[PDB]
């Protein structure tokens, strides 16, 4: 058998049997990423301290002015 299970009309020979099974497409798949691409594009060490400290300087001035208005 095995030439009556995989017919492929013609083929003249036991080789050239159909042989259609699963696999990667011709040319493989896309290059798959595996590294750790963690983007560190956030606020830096400064700009975070200077945003906080700018607030505990202007916002505290505003607390002061609000205390003046309340008084």
């Amino acid at each position: 058998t095995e030439a009556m299970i995989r017919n492929k009309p013609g083929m003249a020979s036991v080789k050239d049997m159909p042989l259609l099974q699963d696999g990667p497409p011709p040319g493989g798949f896309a290059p798959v990423r595996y590294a750790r691409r963690i983007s560190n594009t956030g606020p830096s060490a400064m700009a975070m301290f200077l945003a906080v400290s700018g607030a505990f300087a202007w916002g505290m001035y505003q607390v002061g002015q609000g205390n003046k208005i309340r008084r």
Partner: protein, 150 residues
């Protein structure tokens, strides 16, 4: 020697029907255990196997002569040990058919042992029609008490 054995076990399994699942002697088979041990793993015969009608050999020996390989063991057992001379190898070639040429129940006692003689399911106990399998049966080496031969 091994190539000769594989050759012959291919011929035997060539015109032999795929009756192993429905064969009563499926597990306890010389043909299955010689093919799975000395015969080739594959068969190149992809054509029309020969088939043979089932002879009526009585209420003891269920007969499926298509499975039978025409090794002649039973037709010798009935002629010699059983001594009744009813079985025969009728015909020649692949058309060879083992059994009585006229419908003739094996009137001889001692002719139920042809099933153990038979290396193939073909001749099987009709009482033990299909009720069990060669692996389920737990065997005890008992004796017999029907007749005083023990």
């Amino acid at each position: 020697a091994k190539k000769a054995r594989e050759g012959v076990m291919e011929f035997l399994l060539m015109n032999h029907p795929l009756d192993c699942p429905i064969c009563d002697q499926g597990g306890e088979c010389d043909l299955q255990d010689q093919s799975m041990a000395f015969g080739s793993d594959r068969g190149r015969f992809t054509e029309m196997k020969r088939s043979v009608v089932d002879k009526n050999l009585g209420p003891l020996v269920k007969t499926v002569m298509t499975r039978c390989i025409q090794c002649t063991r039973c037709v010798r057992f009935a002629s010699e040990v059983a001594g009744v001379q009813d079985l025969g190898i009728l015909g020649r070639g692949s058309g060879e058919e083992i059994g009585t040429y006229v419908e003739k129940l094996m009137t001889s006692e001692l002719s139920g042992n042809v099933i153990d003689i038979c290396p193939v399911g073909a001749l099987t106990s009709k009482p033990f029609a299909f009720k069990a399998r060669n692996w389920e049966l737990k065997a005890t080496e008992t004796i017999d008490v029907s007749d005083a031969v023990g």
